[PDB]
Structure 1
Amino acid sequence: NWVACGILEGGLKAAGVLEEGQYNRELAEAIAAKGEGFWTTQFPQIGDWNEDQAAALADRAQTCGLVKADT
């Protein structure tokens, strides 16, 4: 619903990953970049988790109509 999607929108804006006219792929990339840190650099599995969760979150953002579908 709009409330859940709005909370998601606000949070992503506040985290500095969501912007205007952004495609799903771009949002996912921005989230993964902000998720990088000591653990993603040291362990492949953590780096993969970061990318997979980022993609999943961007997907939820798209469903919430916050980003454009990849074409």
Structure 2
Amino acid sequence: LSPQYNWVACGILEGGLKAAGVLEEGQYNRELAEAIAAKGEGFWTTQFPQIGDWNEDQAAALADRAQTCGLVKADT
């Protein structure tokens, strides 16, 4: 069992995503990923496709970690 998914790690993740304004109630994985990506947009994502892509990919990965932590619903 990796400490990376214990309630302390998951609770830090959950607090941080709430404080960042991206996590909410009854949210699906996809919705969280989209919300993270929207907040990650800025000068660099606009100017360079590779950075836009990095933003989306990391948002997706973070939303996946949130789902593992039981913070969002799976996609159906």
2:50 to 16, 20, 45: 45
SS of residue paired to 1:19: coil
For the aligned residues, what is the CA RMSD? 0.1
Within 2, Cα distance between the matches of 1:34 and 1:55? 13
1:7 to 9, 12, 17: 12
Give the ranges of 4+ consecutive aligned residues of structure 1 lying more than 2 Å apart after TM superposition: none
Within 2, Cα distance between the matches of 1:3 and 1:39? 33
Residues 47-68 of structure 1: CA distance to partner in whole angstroms, max 9, x if unpaired? Answer: 0000000000000000000000
Within 1, Cα distance between the matches of 2:59 and 2:75? 15
Q: What TM-score do you get using the length of structure 2 for normalisation?
A: 0.93
Within 1, Cα distance between the matches of 2:13 and 2:26? 17
CA shift, 1:41, in A, is 0.1
- Considering only CA atoms, is the larger Rg found in Structure 1 or Structure 2? 2
Identity level (%): 100
Q: What TM-score do you get using the length of structure 1 for normalisation?
A: 1.00
Within 1, Cα distance between the matches of 2:13 and 2:29? 14
Residues 11-64 of structure 1: CA distance to partner in whole angstroms, max 9, x if unpaired? Answer: 000000000000000000000000000000000000000000000000000000
